[PDB]
C-alpha cells in the first residue's frame, strides 16, 4: 500500500 516507501 505504501506511497512514500522510505517511510513504510
Amino acid at each position, epitope marked *: 500500500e505504501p506511497q*512514500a516507501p522510505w517511510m513504510e
Partner: antibody, heavy 117, light 112 residues
Framework: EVKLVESEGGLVQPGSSMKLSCTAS????????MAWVRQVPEKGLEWVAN????????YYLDSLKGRFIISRDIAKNILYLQMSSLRCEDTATYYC??????????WGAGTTVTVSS | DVVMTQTPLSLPVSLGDQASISCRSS???????????LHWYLQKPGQSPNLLIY???NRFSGVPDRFSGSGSGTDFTLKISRVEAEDLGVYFC????????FGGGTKLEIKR
C-alpha cells in the same frame, strides 16, 4: 486536467513567514499523498515535504528544522506549505506534486520564492 | 544519504540515433519490500519536470515505446531510441527507496 496550480510566491524578507498554496482538481484529494519539491538553478531538485491521505503523517527534509509545515484542507482541495523563519537558502522554484508509489506523476508549473531584504 | 550520480552531464545526439544515460546510486535501491523505486523525469526548456519512467522500467502514460529504462541494484540506464528534436531537455533520475534524492541531470542536446 490533470492539474496542480501553485499560488503566487514572490518576495519575502528573512525571518518572516510565508505560505504557499496549491490547488488540486480532477482527483479525490484525500486519495493521494502530496509533496513539495524545490529547484535552485546550479543546485538541482530537492524533496521538501510530503503528506499522506488525511494529513496524519508527514515527511520533511531534515535540514529544514521543522520550519516548514505541509498541510492539506480536504474540504477545500488545497495543499499548503507554511515556511516559517524564512532563510536565504530557501530561495527557489517550488513545485506542488502528486505522489503515487514513490513517484511524482503530476507536477504544478512551479512558483518562485525569493528571500531578500 | 544516498547519492544519485548521473553521466554524462551533457549528451550530444544526432536525430534518429540512440541516446544512453547512466544513473548510479550509492546504495542498493532494492527496498525491503522487493521493489526498486528508481524513476526518470524529463524537464523540457521552460517547463516543469514530468514523469517518464517509474519503478525502473515502467513507461508513464503518453510516453513513446522508444523511451526504455533498465538496470538493477545500483546501476540504471535510460535509453532513447530514434531521437527526435522534442526530446531535448534535462533528464533526471530519482530514488525513493530511501530518504528521497535526485540525480544532477543529463542535458540531451540535438546535433545539427
Amino acid at each position: 486536467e490533470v492539474k496542480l496550480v501553485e499560488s503566487e510566491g514572490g518576495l519575502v524578507q528573512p525571518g518572516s513567514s510565508m505560505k504557499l498554496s496549491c490547488t488540486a482538481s480532477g482527483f479525490t484529494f484525500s486519495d493521494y499523498y502530496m509533496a513539495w519539491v524545490r529547484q535552485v538553478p546550479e543546485k538541482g531538485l530537492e524533496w521538501v515535504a510530503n503528506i499522506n491521505y488525511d494529513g496524519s503523517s508527514t515527511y520533511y527534509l531534515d535540514s529544514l528544522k521543522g520550519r516548514f509545515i505541509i498541510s492539506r484542507d480536504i474540504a477545500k482541495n488545497i495543499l499548503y506549505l507554511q515556511m516559517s523563519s524564512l532563510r536565504c537558502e530557501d530561495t527557489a522554484t517550488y513545485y506542488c506534486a502528486r505522489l503515487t508509489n514513490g513517484y511524482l506523476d503530476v507536477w504544478g508549473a512551479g512558483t518562485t520564492v525569493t528571500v531578500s531584504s | 544519504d544516498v547519492v544519485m550520480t548521473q553521466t554524462p552531464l551533457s549528451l550530444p545526439v544526432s536525430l534518429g540515433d540512440q541516446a544512453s544515460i547512466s544513473c548510479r546510486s550509492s546504495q542498493s535501491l532494492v527496498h525491503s519490500n522487493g521493489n526498486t523505486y528508481l524513476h526518470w523525469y524529463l524537464q523540457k526548456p521552460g517547463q516543469s519536470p514530468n514523469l517518464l519512467i517509474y519503478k525502473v522500467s515502467n513507461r508513464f502514460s503518453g510516453v513513446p515505446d522508444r523511451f526504455s529504462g533498465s538496470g538493477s541494484g545500483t546501476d540504471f540506464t535510460l535509453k532513447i531510441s530514434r531521437v527526435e528534436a522534442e526530446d531535448l531537455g534535462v533528464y533526471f533520475c530519482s530514488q525513493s527507496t530511501h530518504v528521497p534524492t535526485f540525480g544532477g541531470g543529463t542535458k540531451l542536446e540535438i546535433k545539427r
